[PDB]
Design a protein around this ligand. Structure first.
Ligand SMILES: Nc1nc2c(ncn2[C@@H]2O[C@H](COP(=O)(O)OP(=O)(O)OP(=O)(O)O)[C@@H](O)[C@H]2O)c(=O)[nH]1
Ligand SMILES: Nc1nc2c(ncn2[C@@H]2O[C@H](COP(=O)(O)OP(=O)(O)O)[C@@H](O)[C@H]2O)c(=O)[nH]1
Ligand SMILES: Nc1nc2c(ncn2[C@@H]2O[C@H](COP(=O)(O)OP(=O)(O)O)[C@@H](O)[C@H]2O)c(=O)[nH]1
Ligand SMILES: [Mg+2]
Lengths: 439, 50, 429, 20, 51, 230, 51, 56, 429
């Protein structure tokens, strides 16, 4: 068992899923056609692909994934792409008219009429499933379908699956770079769903990914392809503990306990190292201590947040490859002893460690340089309220003149919704800073 | 010697962790990463050239 | 006289696998179950740990526990994993998540019925069960919760049997889990109530042994489990083999437990030396007694020199002279009375086992009821108070229905134990 | 009487692939 | 372009040149034909699609 | 066959026949006097479609005397029931071999929280309110006897009268009488559920003078709890 | 050839000789194996022979 | 339309001033308490009791 | 000393076919009817189940019944179909339609005349028979209806001889129809005062026997039927083979029926070992008795925790000593006497037979009369009250000449039986 159901919503979520699945196929040996080499004896057979792929009578290895987009463009291009015979013709839902970066339209008018069969497909996946570890959602709250429709799906999943774990990777608007102008509206309106119907939320804004790619990964023209590849790498690193063997195997509900101290407190930071190119890959020493230091560098997170502008609460480190407990303990000790990184006074340990024997894989033409050892970070820290501060300031600038609100009003949303989301986000940031407040 | 017949797990004087091939494994890891990194820097040069 | 062992959780199961490898090597049992021992002493008392089958296969008296089936699968894949009986692998579908509440009330309870069935049947298979053994980690969820739930229902069924628990208490700088203080605090009072003798293990001092005594360049969990298996096998040396001065688990308990709540022992092993320093070391009773009392040699992260030894026990193995094995104890008492408690004269018990581990002329396991255990308990208490003050991670535990009042119960019981050790340390004649 | 469920008729000209 | 072909050599893979491999806990039975040996082969505890 | 006709056709003596008959009737009388689960009846305001039917069902329709015979046999049955066979045997023993219960056991019960829990919740209230709370003087005979015994033992050990804080110990102990008849405590209490005494010989225990509570069978979950397969 | 219960360790102690560590590898193999076997003698009748 | 959900099912975070009860260490002399415990303890014997005869 | 058997319904026919295969294998009778056994003990008492013809063929003493001729064709085309007498295949044209009324009043009656003709012919053809056996399922139409009609007619005709019936009581978790409550109630209230003794079968327990004891991949109905066949063979082994401690069906009836209405028994088999764990466990009398009294080993799905054994009976086969086959019964009677009742002391009947089932050196069949057997009756009665309270599916039964009074009387008898079992479920001392 130990399988999780992946859900991808919006152009951004669909491309995240495309990168994740092209990584997982190479991770487990499934070819783009959907077939992987198999044994003859029934006793000896690995099921490391069970977490992501479900076997079929015809030998196919269908991913345990759903794609959902109101705009048919991305899903149709996937249907015409390389993995056409990999991805199921169903569970690849297509709409007819997009949300047009409108949370109200994606949550009340157009999201309503497609979420109905979205739950049908998700529950079909769950019925095929037998050991569900959780739901594995990828989207961007910047737009309409990613925010409104993703939200709607989140509360329907919560109401029809009880306390099943949900891991939501959301591409928040960056502090200073964003595609849309109503993007702050969409993000703020989605904050409620990300707060109430998301057990753990991960921040994946594009600003930090672009800067990390330019600085360490050393690319002139970072693109959505590269950022989705990085997101796929971080997702694979997080799930590799239950995917493969390791000295300290950790499961989804296993590290949720060590990551989330309070139910309202679950929006966590993420980082990956060594995220380096071939240029520095054979010039800088990549030991366990060095990769841990690079992880805890406050310029290396996939989210552009400064841990020094807050204080850590719980760091979960997914070590993979050459890693050994005797070195990860020393890395934890040196992280503790250096004072540029602080923890809350009420969490003395503050560290969860999971060691996996599988070194991370790469992709053809991979921007990541292949390394024998790596480590991922999932950190709950009080500094995450700062990106919420940025986004609500954008929202306040937008909403002072009540601009771009007529679309939401005409798509069936009350104006008071903006207010409700505003005090909800304010309460969230207050709760964060109060968690970080000294006793 | 390192091939003592009478030091099994029960005697506890021959451990599994001394790791006598530690230096050799480091050298092999280092050569492997040199091959990988040279190949990938060639790939990066090819990407720029293309 | 038979002892049946149960290993719970990832840590406990791997420790038990290494321990069973050690015992099978001791008794000349290869992984397929046959007996290729070189002497009949390994066959005389092979019934203590192994039960013979119809075909002569020696099945270990072992019961395996977890919620994650991966630990069972890895144990079966282990070199000696084919020794264990297939039905003794009891496992669940979802792990405990380091959550003592799931390990003790919801997932453990719904799974422990078959565990008790297996333990009961294997206990009744024994002619006269000498005791029950447990190996688990307090920091973990299924190791601590399910192990405590085991011992709670084993003590009630067998009140007079020796409960031989090996609990791996997490260390601060060795920690890899944040709810470890919670699990340890919730398990300490259960250990106090339902364990004839609890002999603690700490990875801090285990790594200290591996790095300074053995000078291993990269010790993994296997070396730590080997060090634990050392004492796990040495505590029953007199049980499995003859000796000049025999002993057993109950004799050790009566000589090491002055009061019912004072049954937490800090241990050690000897001889242990690095590969390069082993040809320079002349094995002797003096060297063994030097290494057994060394603070660095202790596999607990509680400094022996800070506290005072309530009781000590020397399970010496091998052919050695009795007046000197007794003299190395009386002399150390006489020259270090400050390290021992005054009102308990003759703090050291010594026992001799005829057969040492093969390849060793003689060895020794040290069992110490030092009053310094309250320090390593007080460290956990400080961590628990820090986490509990701000309701940190209480929602995960209260999701299963466990109570803040029960958290307070655990804290109060642990504080009572710590103050018990402190008061018996500073009590005078 | 509720409208038919999972109906493919009446969706023409509307942004719905299924009807209720 | 031999990246996905060769596998990183670790403390846990052993040294292919020397042939000595660390024998650690937490290793499942190996099938030498999948993408990598470090694969959660759960046949013993999860007799998949049967029983 | 019915039992009466069976013995009419059998080859018993008349006295043996009436003896077997009487045994059966007394068994059935005891069964009648025993408690049951009520014979359920069709509900009031039942759907009409449950009763009224179709021509197909009246085509497949294939009794008054049968019902009358049923009712007559039933009526004579309850008439006979309306118109002690099973007895207990003395388990008592002669003087000098009798067994006596424990008044402390009678006082103690599962429903009431134990003395250790009582003291713990008193300490909890003390800590929560921040003020010292006076422990009420217990009026139970077992409690006062235990308090007196603790005071006497403390006087015998230490040559002074114990303080109230030190007498707070009498609450958190389980007490029992010994063979000599003096009040004492159990250091290693045994479970109320049946357990094992492993001396040089291994022996069952249902009830021993070493248990806190009265003997009770342990509640065990059903073996067929979930579906047999995954 | 299982060693008997009443194995006389005094005989083995008389047989062992000082400065008798072989140089060659299989000779060391057998000598250390014999040393390992030597440790299975009982102390209660260590020198007892019944003569 | 999809119904608006304003629910706040997840509990509010505890305040830093809000704390549980800590300590509760039994402030009593443990050595004396244990000695009195031993003095007043009754003997216990796992030996089978003297069962009365069938003629009793 | 012989038993003549009948199979009713599809379930009963399949179970009887498997039972006859097992018996033919034990007695060395190949499907063509000849004898190839390699012992005189197989021929000395082969007349218990087989009658010799003019040509030496051994025709089984079996009567087959089903309104559906499909199962008749299947059983005669099976591997052992040619064994049975052609005239004993008694069948109708239209099936019972899962209707107790149709199988007991309308269609069963028109065929029960020829059925009794065949059974009477066989009974008088053989010399002096111990009694009649029947195999059926209570949840079916003809297995319950015609089975109960057959039992009633055979009690009319031969009350001198014993009556044993194997009824497969359905379970909601195995329920493949909707009229299990009606059929099961209408059959049990018959068997209470008609069948001399009726041991219970549940497919729910049969399924997880194949898991907690066999761990096999694909369990089918034929796989299940072998358990019933093996227990039947163990029950009637002593009539066919010698033993140190001999027994027969009347002996079991006397030792297991304290009161006439308390004749429903809970039954099990041992050993039940898996292929993987076959060599791991060492089979002995202790393991056999532990498996006998293990709750999960029962092949009826009622929990024995909630009831107390009225009586028990262990029918051992093979080569074992007598004092350790009585001492283990003493051992259980002492260890877990809470399973037993005090007013009936020494609740265990024992028998020893020298011939074990093929493939066993030791084996045993366990038949228990417990107060827990009313759990299935209570659950079926709850379902019956739920269905009958709203008059659901009652028109089918009332259109076949049956009245509501039959259901009322069936419910009354079921409640009386449940209450008289629950009399002694209290754990009095
Ligand atoms: N990291 C990452 N971010 C993306 C990617 N694609 C889009 N984004 C960002 O995520 C936001 C989501 O907006 P859209 O791409 O329109 O997604 P959407 O709202 O579901 O699409 P519509 O329903 O048609 O409005 C955009 O504003 C982008 O800035 C991607 O592939 N990777
Ligand atoms: N000595 C030793 N310690 C271990 C081993 N495995 C885990 N641990 C320790 O156990 C702690 C975590 O316990 P965990 O795996 O959660 O226990 P579980 O939940 O019961 O399986 C870690 O801090 C490790 O230091 C082992 O094989 N040997
Ligand atoms: N053990 C066993 N049970 C069976 C078999 N065939 C049917 N059953 C059970 O019997 C029930 C149906 O009874 P049915 O065959 O219709 O009875 P009939 O109408 O009298 O033949 C189902 O719920 C099955 O579980 C079999 O071969 N073996
Ligand atoms: Mg779009």
């Amino acid at each position: 068992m130990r399988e999780a159901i992946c859900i991808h919503i919006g152009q951004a979520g669909c491309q995240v899923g495309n990168a994740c699945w092209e990584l997982f196929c190479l991770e487990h040996g499934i070819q783009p056609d959907g077939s992987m080499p198999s044994d003859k004896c029934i006793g000896v057979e690995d099921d490391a692909f069970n977490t992501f792929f479900s076997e079929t009578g015809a030998g196919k290895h269908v991913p345990r994934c759903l794609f959902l987009d109101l705009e048919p463009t991305v899903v149709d291009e996937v249907r015409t792409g390389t993995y056409r015979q990999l991805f199921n013709p169903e569970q690849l839902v297509s709409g007819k008219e997009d949300a047009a970066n409108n949370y109200a339209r994606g949550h009340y008018t157009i999201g309503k009429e497609i979420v109905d069969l979205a739950l049908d497909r998700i529950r079909k996946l769950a019925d095929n499933c037998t050991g569900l570890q959780g739901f594995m959602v990828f989207h961007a709250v910047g737009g309409g379908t990613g925010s409104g429709l993703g939200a709607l799906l989140l509360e329907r999943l919560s109401v029809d699956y009880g306390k099943k774990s949900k891991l939501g990777y959301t591409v928040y608007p960056s502090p200073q770079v964003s595609t849309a102008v109503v993007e702050p509206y969409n993000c703020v309106l989605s904050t409620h769903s990300l707060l109430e119907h998301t057990d753990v939320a991960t921040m994946l804004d594009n600003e930090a990914i672009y800067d990390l790619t330019r600085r360490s990964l050393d690319i002139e023209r970072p693109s959505y392809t590269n950022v989705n590849r990085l997101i796929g790498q971080v997702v694979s690193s997080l799930t590799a503990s239950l995917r493969f063997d390791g000295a300290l195997n950790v499961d989804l509900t296993e590290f949720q306990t060590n990551l989330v101290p309070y139910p309202r407190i679950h929006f966590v930071l993420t980082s990956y190292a060594p995220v380096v190119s071939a240029e520095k890959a054979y010039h800088e020493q990549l030991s366990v201590a060095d990769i841990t230091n690079s992880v805890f560098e406050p310029a290396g997170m996939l989210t552009k947040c400064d841990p020094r502008h807050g204080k850590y609460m719980s760091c979960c480190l997914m070590y993979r490859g050459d890693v050994v407990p005797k070195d990860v303990n020393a890395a934890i000790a040196t992280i503790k002893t250096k004072r540029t990184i602080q923890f809350v006074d009420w969490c003395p340990t503050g560290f969860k460690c999971g060691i996996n024997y599988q070194p991370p894989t790469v992709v053809p033409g991979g921007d990541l340089a292949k390394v024998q050892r790596a480590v991922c970070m999932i950190a709950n820290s009080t500094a995450i309220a700062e990106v919420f501060a940025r986004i609500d300031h954008k929202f306040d600038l937008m909403y002072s003149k009540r601009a771009f609100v007529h679309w939401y009003v005409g798509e069936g949303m009350e104006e008071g919704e903006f207010s409700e989301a505003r005090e909800d986000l304010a309460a969230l940031e207050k709760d964060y800073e109060e968690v970080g407040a000294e006793s | 010697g390192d091939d003592d017949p009478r030091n099994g797990p029960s005697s506890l004087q021959k451990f599994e962790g001394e790791d006598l091939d530690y230096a050799a494994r480091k050298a092999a890891q280092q050569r492997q990463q040199r091959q990988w990194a040279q190949q990938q820097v060639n790939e990066k040069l090819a990407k720029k050239w293309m | 006289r038979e002892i049946v062992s149960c290993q719970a959780g990832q840590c406990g199961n791997q420790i038990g696998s290494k321990f069973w490898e050690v015992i099978s090597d001791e008794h000349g049992v290869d992984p397929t179950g046959t007996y290729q021992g070189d002497s009949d002493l390994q066959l005389e008392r092979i019934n203590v740990y192994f039960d013979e089958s119809s075909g002569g296969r020696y099945v270990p008296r072992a019961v395996l526990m977890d919620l994650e089936p991966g630990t069972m699968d890895s144990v079966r894949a282990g070199p000696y994993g084919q020794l264990f009986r297939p039905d003794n692998f009891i496992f669940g579908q979802s792990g405990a998540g380091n959550n003592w509440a799931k390990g003790h009330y919801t997932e453990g309870a719904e799974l422990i019925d078959s565990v008790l069935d297996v333990c009961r049947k294997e206990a009744e298979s024994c002619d006269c069960l000498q005791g029950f053994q447990l190996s688990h980690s307090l920091g973990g969820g299924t190791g601590s919760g399910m192990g405590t739930l085991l011992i709670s229902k084993l003590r009630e069924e067998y009140p007079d049997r020796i409960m031989m628990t090996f609990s791996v208490i997490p260390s601060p700088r060795v920690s890899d889990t944040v709810v470890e203080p919670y699990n340890t605090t919730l398990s300490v009072h259960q250990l106090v109530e339902n364990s004839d003798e609890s002999m603690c293990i700490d990875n801090e001092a285990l790594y200290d042994i591996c790095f300074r005594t053995l000078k291993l360049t990269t010790p993994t969990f296997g070396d730590l489990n080997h060090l634990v298996a050392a004492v796990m096998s040495g505590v029953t040396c007199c049980l499995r083999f003859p000796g000049q001065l025999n002993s057993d688990l109950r004799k050790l308990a009566v000589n090491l437990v002055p009061f019912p709540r004072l049954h937490f022992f800090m241990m050690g092993f000897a001889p242990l030396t690095s590969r390069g320093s082993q040809q320079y070391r002349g094995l002797s009773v003096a060297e063994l007694t030097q290494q057994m009392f060394d603070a660095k040699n202790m596999m607990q992260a509680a400094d022996p020199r800070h506290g005072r030894y309530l009781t000590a026990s020397a399970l010496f193995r091998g052919r050695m002279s009795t007046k000197e094995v007794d003299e190395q104890m009386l002399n150390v008492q006489n020259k270090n009375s400050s390290y021992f408690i005054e009102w308990i004269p003759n703090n050291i018990k010594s026992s001799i086992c005829d057969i040492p581990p093969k390849g060793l002329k003689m060895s020794v396991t040290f069992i110490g009821n030092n009053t310094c255990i309250q320090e390593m308990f007080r460290r956990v208490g400080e961590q628990f108070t820090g986490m509990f003050r701000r309701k940190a991670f209480l929602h995960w535990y209260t999701g299963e229905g466990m109570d803040e009042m029960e958290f307070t119960e655990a804290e109060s019981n642990m504080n009572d134990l710590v103050s018990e050790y402190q008061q018996y340390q500073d009590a005078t004649v | 009487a509720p409208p038919p469920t999972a109906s493919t008729f009446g969706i023409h000209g509307t942004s719905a692939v299924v009807a209720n | 372009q031999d990246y996905l072909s060769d596998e990183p050599i670790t403390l846990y893979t052993g040294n292919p040149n020397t042939g000595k491999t660390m024998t650690v806990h937490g290793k499942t039975p190996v099938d030498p034909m999948s993408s990598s040996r470090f694969g959660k082969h759960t046949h013993f505890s999860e007799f998949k699609y049967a029983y | 066959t019915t039992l009466e006709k069976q013995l009419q056709a059998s080859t018993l003596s008349r006295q043996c026949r009436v003896d077997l008959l009487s045994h059966a009737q007394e068994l059935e009388r005891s069964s009648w006097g025993l408690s049951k689960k009520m014979i359920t009846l069709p509900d009031i305001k039942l759907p009409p479609a449950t009763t009224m039917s179709t021509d197909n069902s009246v085509k497949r329709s294939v009794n008054k005397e049968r019902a009358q015979e049923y009712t007559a046999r039933k009526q004579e049955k309850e008439d006979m029931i309306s118109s002690t066979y099973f007895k207990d045997c003395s388990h008592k023993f002669v003087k000098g071999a009798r067994g006596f219960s424990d008044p402390f056991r009678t006082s103690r019960s599962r429903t009431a929280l134990s003395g250790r829990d009582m003291d713990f919740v008193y300490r909890y209230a003390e800590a929560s309110t921040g003020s010292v709370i006076e422990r009420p003087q217990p009026a139970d005979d077992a409690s006062v006897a235990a308090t007196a015994a603790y005071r006497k033992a403390f006087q015998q050990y230490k040559g002074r009268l114990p303080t109230t804080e030190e007498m707070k110990e009498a609450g958190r102990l389980v007490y029992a009488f010994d063979e000599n008849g003096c009040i004492g405590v159990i250091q290693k209490p045994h479970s109320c559920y049946p357990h094992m005494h492993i001396s040089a010989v291994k022996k069952p225990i249902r009830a021993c003078p070493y248990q806190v509570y009265s003997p009770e069978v342990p509640p065990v979950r059903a073996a067929r709890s979930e579906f047999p397969g995954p | 050839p299982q060693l008997a219960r009443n194995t006389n360790g005094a005989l083995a102690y008389s047989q062992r000789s000082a400065d008798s560590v072989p140089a060659d590898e299989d000779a060391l193999k057998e000598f250390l194996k014999s040393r390992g076997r030597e440790g299975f003698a009982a102390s209660a009748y260590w020198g007892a022979t019944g003569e | 339309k999809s119904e608006y959900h304003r629910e706040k099912t997840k509990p509010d975070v505890p305040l830093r001033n809000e704390h549980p009860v800590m300590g509760l260490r039994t402030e009593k002399n443990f050595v004396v308490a244990n000695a009195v415990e031993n003095t007043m303890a009754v003997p216990t014997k796992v030996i089978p009791a003297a069962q009365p005869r069938a003629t009793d």
